[PDB]
Design a protein around this ligand. Sequence first.
Ligand SMILES: Cc1cc(CCCCCCCOc2ccc(C3=NCCO3)cc2)on1
Ligand SMILES: Cc1cc(CCCCCCCOc2ccc(C3=NCCO3)cc2)on1
Lengths: 297, 297, 243, 243, 49, 40, 40, 239, 239
Amino acid sequence: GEIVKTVANTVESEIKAELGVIPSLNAVETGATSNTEPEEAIQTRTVINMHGTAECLVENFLGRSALVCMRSFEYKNHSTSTSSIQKNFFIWTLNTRELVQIRRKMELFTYLRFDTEITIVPTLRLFSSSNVSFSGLPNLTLQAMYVPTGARKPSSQDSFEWQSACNPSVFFKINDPPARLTIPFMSINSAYANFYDGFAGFEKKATVLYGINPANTMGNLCLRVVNSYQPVQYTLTVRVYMKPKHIKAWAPRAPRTMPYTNILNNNYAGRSAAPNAPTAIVSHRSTIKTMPNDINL
Amino acid sequence: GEIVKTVANTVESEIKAELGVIPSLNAVETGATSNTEPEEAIQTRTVINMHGTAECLVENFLGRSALVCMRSFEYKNHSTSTSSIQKNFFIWTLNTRELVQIRRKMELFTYLRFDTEITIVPTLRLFSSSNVSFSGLPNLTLQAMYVPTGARKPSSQDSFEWQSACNPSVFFKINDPPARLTIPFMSINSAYANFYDGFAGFEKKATVLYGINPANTMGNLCLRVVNSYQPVQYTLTVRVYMKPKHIKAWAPRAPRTMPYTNILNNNYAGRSAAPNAPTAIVSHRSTIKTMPNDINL
Amino acid sequence: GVPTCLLPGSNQFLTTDDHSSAPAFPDFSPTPEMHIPGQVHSMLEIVQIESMMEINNVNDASGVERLRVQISAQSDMDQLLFNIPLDIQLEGPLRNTLLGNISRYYTHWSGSLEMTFMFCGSFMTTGKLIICYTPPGGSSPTDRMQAMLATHVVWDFGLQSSITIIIPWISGSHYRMFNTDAKAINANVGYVTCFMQTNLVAPVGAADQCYIVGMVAAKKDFNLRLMRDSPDIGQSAILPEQA
Amino acid sequence: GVPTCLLPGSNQFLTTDDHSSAPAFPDFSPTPEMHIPGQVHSMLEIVQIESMMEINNVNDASGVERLRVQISAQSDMDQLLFNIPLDIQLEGPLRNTLLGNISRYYTHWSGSLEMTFMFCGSFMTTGKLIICYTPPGGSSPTDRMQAMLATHVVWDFGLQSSITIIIPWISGSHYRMFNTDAKAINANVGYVTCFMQTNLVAPVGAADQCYIVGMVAAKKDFNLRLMRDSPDIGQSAILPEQA
Amino acid sequence: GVPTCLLPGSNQFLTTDDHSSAPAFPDFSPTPEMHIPGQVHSMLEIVQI
Amino acid sequence: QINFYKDSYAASASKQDFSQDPSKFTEPVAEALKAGAPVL
Amino acid sequence: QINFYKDSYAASASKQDFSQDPSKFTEPVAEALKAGAPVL
Amino acid sequence: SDRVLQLKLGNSSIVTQEAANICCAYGEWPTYLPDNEAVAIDKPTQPETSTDRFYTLKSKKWESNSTGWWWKLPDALNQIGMFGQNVQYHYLYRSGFLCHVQCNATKFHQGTLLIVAIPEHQIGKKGTGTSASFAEVMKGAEGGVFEQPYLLDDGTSLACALVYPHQWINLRTNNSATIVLPWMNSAPMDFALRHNNWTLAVIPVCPLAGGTGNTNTYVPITISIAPMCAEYNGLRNAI
Amino acid sequence: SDRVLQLKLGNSSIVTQEAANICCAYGEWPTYLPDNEAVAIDKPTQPETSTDRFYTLKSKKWESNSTGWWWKLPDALNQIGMFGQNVQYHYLYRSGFLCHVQCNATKFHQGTLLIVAIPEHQIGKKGTGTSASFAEVMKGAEGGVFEQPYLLDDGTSLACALVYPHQWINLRTNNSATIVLPWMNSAPMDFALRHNNWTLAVIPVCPLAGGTGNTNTYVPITISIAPMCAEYNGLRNAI
Ligand SMILES: Cc1cc(CCCCCCCOc2ccc(C3=NCCO3)cc2)on1
Ligand SMILES: Cc1cc(CCCCCCCOc2ccc(C3=NCCO3)cc2)on1
């Protein structure tokens, strides 16, 4: 382990014709990457590089705010002849696999440990009814409460699990800056696992799904409109952005090539034709001797 | 009294066969909790724990903002042929027993001393009339004034007890951040008492209710809409959240098991069936030898 | 003025924030502190106290019968007496305990536990029991043949009327979850079984049928995290001043 | 109060900001770190690992045939074997590589690359190849007459079954773009060609037709800038818990 | 600019707050104090009469 | 504790105090019971 | 790192660490392969 | 140190033979009120021998279906001797209490009593919204009877009643219990006729039983309470 | 140092002649769990010679159309010898694995095998939303067969499979491969019957072939796995 502020420099070289020295020849069967340096592989000069490597760090690779949730729900009167349930709220079943870009950057590494900064951005619209008139959006109050594993799940807008006596909750308005807070590293293990080659339960039944981690029970995020229902119908879209910090990564993975189909597992259906086809990840070319982008003069 | 930054460590042990030494045997008739250490009760290894205990402190157990009040009232024209009273306000009769979660966490200890941070979150709605049109919520001004014991209680929105020449009052808008302030420890005694086994008056009549503390006369909270009535009817819901700070707790209680029925006393009706039934706090199982969650292979 | 930019998270009300606030009563003089016995500094001090548990939680026992357990003079040998699940989150004997009630405010727990069983027979009643904690992974032991292989303590009645068994922290992960799925790996703790070792022997003058009282507590290495609203108590409306 | 003016950029949510935020769980105690092998500190450590590439990316090869290249005993001399474009941004052999996949998250790249070719014939099979990197500016070389003039390495099969050619950083600008126009000056890197040097000779008992496996990686002087959402993976709707 | 977040209790008017305020009359010169008999410093001095 | 205001009770959450005396609830006996010995 | 809040995990992005050990992925061999020599 | 014990206060002296130990509530011993914590300015009266002595209350029979009994302090002693007289002639009071519970049974008998001192014990009645009346709460030395010992008549659990200072009388090894209680109030003193600090509750966890010759054995339970460090302020006429 | 190698663990000793080198996963050697990282408090059992030894699994024939094979650890050894017995009698386990792959062919044969140790390898099935069943995943020492070695049965790429520790068996210069794997878990220990840390996958990159007299040569591939630094905690009955 050595400190690399800038990439390696290049030193000047001369003619090299020596017996028993073969830098260009390598034995990749040993599993070791070829160590042939450019300096004595070819005829080089002296080059000094000031190019920084800070942006290539995992700190900057992952510590960048990415969308992980987007729920849209109706804010209206949901009462009926006998309903008594407002249902102006949503639950998320906390996870980080619904958005493919952030999911792929999670799964570039086997193990990740980080404290995450969470930003909530709400947006409002009016539903287009037969007779609707818009001249402004109300400044509604929204409560986002984290419900940990095994705690009560609110069943309605008017439910009394929204007291948040112990459950952390954040109150914010539409016109206020988007809500922001920080979740510490909250895994029962020493790191989050993007893959779990096993089962989360002791059972041998088909109910226990393969690949479920008995450490990914992150809990739930219950978001509600604090204001009661309005005379006219609205729609609220909440976007939750996740930003890792204080990141350590372990055992880099093979990058995902096929589109994700669900969040429970890493199954894939493949695309109809290349690229990223079942039998064809890279698109076809004419032959191995044709150049697809030939510069012809 | 010793400082406990992290939980106790474990030391390695060997075979123990000595006469006259019986760590596993205890005399709980003395009222003392069994002191049998895991190290010499079983065969243990050396384990060093870095697990912090800060979140298990009473400071963090109680110093967490919890809902203690929620009043909803109509903001409209309440005048009639001869009323002359606007009545666009509410009184609370200050207490901390209307919400069961915060009440239970209060009553986990006999005595509590703390300075409380109070947050007021208002929300507006339009009443759904026969002909109502909504395109925005007004930015109303609200005055929340604490009226101590024996002081005047305002009788209307236009009443003149809202001068607040000595009574502390806070003015805040709907669109502004929720109001926040701090009440110091204001008991005539050295601590708040969650239970009072006695009567608050010298009388022997039935009017003096048992369990009323002659130190819980906290006063009143009078909240008003400063703006006069609008041409159309609104509804205001005010939520008051209470957060203890600088907390000392004395004489821990037995946790409450039955649902509360009122705020004047700790009477209970019990739930129809187990769990938390009058005769059955914990739900039934088949027999004492059956396992309700058996893992069958 | 000072250059300033409002970051995201401004104008928000977080119920877990830690900030100073404007004092409503300026220059107020609080009552001086008076020494009161029994001051509590941590929640971990109360989970270490003994607390009886409802082993007899069957639909035949009403009230105090549920805190006490049948013990019989046996006409057979090697018979199982009673079982104890260790699912604090779910409905079991360990929920209505100081340890259970306090830890159910939290989501993650760690550390070894202890169980004390007190014999409440007659002075002339003798007996031998074996109490076994079995780590999870399989089914509950039904015969002493399989129960002896796990952690166990042999209790002989005498001058000391109570025995203590330590349930050690045997877990791959640092912490365990109070998950509604008690059957999962992160939530399952293990099994507790009681087997008669030799027999329960009482003379003719003494009552033949005796009782065990079970109690559970935590040790010095117990830890809790992610405190939550407990499902112990509920509410459907604001509590009035009436019935 | 303190004089204050809100500058432009207040009340904005920038996804690349670096500011402290309110902790949602006060005084939370995280799990202590445990040593795990294979800790990664920089993305540049993974682009330096070998990674096979799809040289045989034609509409006749299905799966693993695309990671391996036909090599023939020739009835002629000086014949071209295969070509390798160096357009990481566009659809080519170098995209599905560790170097390619990681660098496609970035927009600008710099530094020399390396290619290792491993011969997978029989021990009695002998042969000589020449691998030439040609700097951009003209057409791809078709004859060894023009290919020998650019950078090249002569590979002779033997005990060492793999050869390494360094593609040096020959660019006027400090960095190069992963531009969709691979034909532009800022994006074009050059050409890679393989020519038989003498022949591929195998005995009668040995298989006449052998294979080369090609691999590409970066050197110590490799740099990346302006990281971007990769076009590798797409999404049309929120991923459900179903098919 | 300086990183800043508006806490709850911002934009509120508390009648018992203790903060400095903008002077409406800049560089105003008040009348010098003159000794007046019977100065009161505490309310507790009058309950003792 | 930062306490931007004049009154001390207006400060934030008090500085952490980890002093623990479980004995007052776990061994509230006048005669101390020594570990590893018959406690009668 | 400025960390205006009490908890340390509430701080901003961690201070830059440029330590690089590519060998663990590039030369994970018990016997070190010397450069410029037949590696067999 | 042994299972024997002698408690000698004033003219009273209780000797016990099958005891366990002395339980001091929260690890404290009752003491006189110091100056820094005093509120009343007139001198309190401190009659040591006349009040700090054992008062024996009227016994209860332990039945097979007994639910339990409770005595509220200082209500149990408010009508007895110099302690009661000083309570009647004075407004403010302060004293700790040493409680000793007697229960004698043969070695062939089985049964277990939990003797728990609950501080500030608010009785909550069940199936009604009305608070408990003065007659039901203030019972004097004659004591009270538990409706629901399973719930401690509070809505709480008897299982979790071990936070409070407590003793077990197990007939195998005990016949007497001793608990020492210091002052329990948020105030230095209080009014005795309207408030009780402590509630001593004896709950039979395991029923009394005998085999074939010891059934229906009349076994009484006796309560002896000794005030300690009693101070009284505010002398006036009796009420 | 040379192409020869001897691995002697316990009673087992493997000598290889046409080897390349020893690949240590991420440049680490398996070690026993230290105190500062331990979680379980009872002593773990450490049977050195009885468990830390080479177990030889059942061989597979290398065909011209072979797609590849995979063995999940410690599932492959969960049914074998003292390692399997200690896994069955214990809840928690921890061990590294030394994997040795044998493949013998003549100098006239050609072919290349990639032996890759993938950590935490979640198998993703193709053309279905249903997760893989217990039967398909937990295969024991009998092993598994790759549907899509091109995708590693993960949706990933075989081309990018060189991040994982790996060996090449090239018939020109190799007949044996050796990879050493330390503990791979976010936790110090785990449950063996429900989770696998490592997956050893042998994928034929270049098909086995011969010229005019060496076609259809029956060439087996053998797997020998040696646990190292095995600890077990939580003694109980077998399951
Ligand atoms: C792999 C892997 C990685 C992880 C980390 C998941 C944590 C980040 C998910 C997004 C967090 O979502 C939250 C949103 C809001 C709140 C919040 N708490 C108090 C009020 O709202 C908490 C979490 O889990 N598995
Ligand atoms: C037990 C026990 C504990 C207590 C403490 C109760 C105090 C906290 C109750 C909530 C405070 O409610 C207030 C709300 C607003 C204001 C305020 N004062 C100036 C303007 O509004 C004051 C109190 O009382 N009994």
